[PDB]
Amino acid sequence: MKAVQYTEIGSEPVVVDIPTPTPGPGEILLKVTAAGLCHSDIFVMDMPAAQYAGGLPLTLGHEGVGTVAELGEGVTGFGVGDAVAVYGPWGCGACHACARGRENYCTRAADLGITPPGYGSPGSMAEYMIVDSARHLVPIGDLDPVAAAPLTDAGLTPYHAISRVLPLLGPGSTAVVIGVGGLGHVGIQILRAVSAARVIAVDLDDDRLALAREVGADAAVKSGAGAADAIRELTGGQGATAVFDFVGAQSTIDTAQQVVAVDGHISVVGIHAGAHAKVGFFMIPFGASVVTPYWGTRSELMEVVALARAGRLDIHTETFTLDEGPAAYRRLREGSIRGRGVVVP
Template sequence: MKAVRFFGHKDVRVVDDMEIPKPSGEEVLLKIGGAGVCHSDLHIIDEGTVSGSVFTLGHENAGWIEEIGSDVKGYKKGDAVLVYGPWGCGHCKPCQQSKENYCDHQSEMAYGGGLGLNGGMAEYMLVPSSRLLVPIYDLDPVIAAPLTDAALTPYSAIKRSLDKLMADEYVVVIGVGGLGHVALQILREISGAEIIACDVTEDKLAFARELGASYTINSKDADAAEQIKKITGIKKAKVVLDFVGATSTIELGTKVVSLDGDLTIVGLGGGHYQYNMSGLPFGVSMTNPYWGSRVELMEVVGLARQKKIHIEIEKYKLDQANEVYDRLREGKIKGRAVLIP
């Protein structure tokens, strides 16, 4: 079968000689409907955040069950499912609580398909356990694939600040890409806070306004923080969600977050922050959440099935993987690109 393989630094190739895996025991073989193209792949490809063996990329996957191992119950051929991305040990306390994104054993194993193990940018994908599947019922797997990360990650980040996102407060969203464009819709649906969105191009800012942002600011402007504070007034933003994570965006966050606010850095842009008591308002919680839980993924499916969130998708073939990664590097993808076998 065809697959998009990561061979090492900046070396991604589409191959056509992979064997279709055979599931046994707890394993499930999925016929892939779509695999989302996440900016985290670029951190792997360009910056080497995951090293070691050659593997198939794609950690945002959905499809139909093709074959189940002998120990799998509750699923049959043809069922449409998402693949929950962070594959924990399945036994520790966080895993028992469905929070495999915070598995105790994260540091000692490859941590998911497309992240060191074979992922879903292929015609078929082997999932180690049906525990890692979430049914999507009537949703189309091509459209649903990005729910597993582009929607789950902002959903989980927003939920942890929900008690601060009241209708008399402001929230700042930095980066209106794959994750950010879903974050805006989740905020619009589950919170009352007024949204200020930041990106670096006028198209992305216009897109943000379509998705529920009341105000948009170009964060390349030298006075971006002042522009935001003009909107919020003295109280500033109760929550800042940074989907870039560069030094400049973290710094912007520290300038516009309010006393007792949340500064949530989701982006893995390699930014640095040096704690400075007088540079950060008192009471601020700074956090770097990772992905979300299996149960939260079920809740995200609920939002999508009720049409409360919609992933904007650009569709491509597996053969176009390198072209798509270039477009993503250049910030040219609107919403999320999905590779379809």
């Protein structure tokens, strides 16, 4: 089968031909219908060899949807042909976090060598993929696969980040979304669906500010040195109840600390090596919590799928073939994908 793989440190990924896998006991083989590209793939491919823990070669793609092609020995709960999304942050399934579906926060996965598809286990950027267990599949019914693939991370990750503090986001609240990319353009829409927060989008690119308004942001403002003042002009001196930073550069985290309200929240979702919030007296308002969330929970993925099925999420995509995979990653690097890139095998 055709697949897109990261094969050597510092190089671009390449299209390869590798055997179509066979599902062992408990496993499910999916025929992949859509595979999302994520900026985390770029972060992973830019890690030095000392840090990189994905293994070589690695089939990329941690945003996967498909149809059940083959059931491994003893697998029940799905039939051949069922359309399914892959729950990505695989955990042990047995610890206190996993028992609540919070496999993203599994305390045993490292020790047991459990790694996610697309970063240690083979991903969805291939014609077929193996899923380890039935509990890592969620039905999507007749959802269009191209718009469904991003739900698994571009949807799930912002959904989790927002869910952590949703009780803060009542009528009268403001939520700032920094970075209107794959994650951010879905995060705006989640905020509008599950809260009455006023949503203010922030991006470097004027076309992405237009995208923000298209998907329901109440205002959209230019990122950089003037952003904090511009957000404060919109909120008055109260600031923003919550800031969801999907960039996570030092400059954006600084903007976040300069606009967050007393008893508010900053979610540092975007990943930039070394960047961090500085949480201390006189550097941040009283009561303003900060976290780096990771991916999301099993029940959250089901909720994201439910939002998509109800028509609440308009996922902006561009479609690529497997052969165009490497080219698509270059597009993502240069910032020329409006929304989410999706490979269709």
